[PDB]
Curated annotation (Swiss-Prot):
This is Large ribosomal subunit protein uL6. GO terms for biological process: cytoplasmic translation. It comes from Pyrococcus furiosus (strain ATCC 43587 / DSM 3638 / JCM 8422 / Vc1). This protein binds to the 23S rRNA, and is important in its secondary structure. It is located near the subunit interface in the base of the L7/L12 stalk, and near the tRNA binding site of the peptidyltransferase center. The chain holds residues 2 to 92 of 184 of the full protein. The keyword Methyltransferase does not apply. GO terms for cellular component: cytosolic large ribosomal subunit. Keywords: Ribonucleoprotein, Ribosomal protein, RNA-binding, rRNA-binding. Part of the 50S ribosomal subunit. Coiled coil: none annotated. The gene is rpl6.
RNA sequence: UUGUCCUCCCGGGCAUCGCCGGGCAGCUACGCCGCAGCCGAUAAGGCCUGAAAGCAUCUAAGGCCGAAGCGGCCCCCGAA
C-alpha cells in the first residue's frame, strides 16, 4: 500500500445537491440531473458536510488512480449541471 | 432400298436394328428457370471522457464507431 488511506473530496456548490445510494451517485442542479455508477472494490463514496468523499483503506497505485478519476468525473458532473458544456467545430 | 430364301403378286425370315432418312413419349445438355442483403457482437485501426504523473495522454476504470471473417434471419436431415 502507498499510504494508510486515501480520501479525495469534491466540494458541492450551493445550487447543486448530490446524493449517493449504494454505488450510484446522483447530481441535481438548475440545468438537469445526472447519474452514474462508480464501483471499485474497496472504494466507498459518501457525502459529508458540503463535500463528496471518495475513501479507501490501504490503497495501491491503481486504487489511487481510480479514486482520482472518480473525483474528476464527479467534478465534471457538477460543472455540467451548473453551467454545462459547449464544443466548437469548423467546417 | 441391296443380297438371298419363302414359286411369282401382296406379305414376311436373316444379313450390326442389314443399311439409309425422319421420329412422338421418356432420359438428357449444347437448352431453360431460381440463388436476401439487413440486423448483433468483434479483429487491425479511427475516436470521446480520464487519472496514475496539478499538464499531457485512445487505457489503467468507463464509452462510441469499425471486416468477403464470427452468430441470426435463409435452405437440407431431424422424436433414440
Amino acid at each position: 500500500p502507498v499510504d494508510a488511506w486515501i480520501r479525495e473530496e469534491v466540494e458541492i456548490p450551493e445550487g447543486v445537491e448530490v446524493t449517493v445510494e449504494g454505488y450510484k451517485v446522483k447530481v441535481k442542479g438548475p440545468k438537469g440531473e445526472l447519474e452514474r455508477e462508480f464501483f471499485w472494490p474497496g472504494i466507498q463514496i459518501f457525502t459529508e458536510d458540503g463535500n463528496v468523499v471518495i475513501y479507501k483503506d490501504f490503497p495501491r497505485r491503481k486504487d489511487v488512480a481510480i479514486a482520482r478519476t472518480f473525483a474528476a468525473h464527479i467534478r465534471n458532473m457538477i460543472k455540467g449541471v451548473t453551467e454545462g458544456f459547449t464544443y466548437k467545430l469548423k467546417v
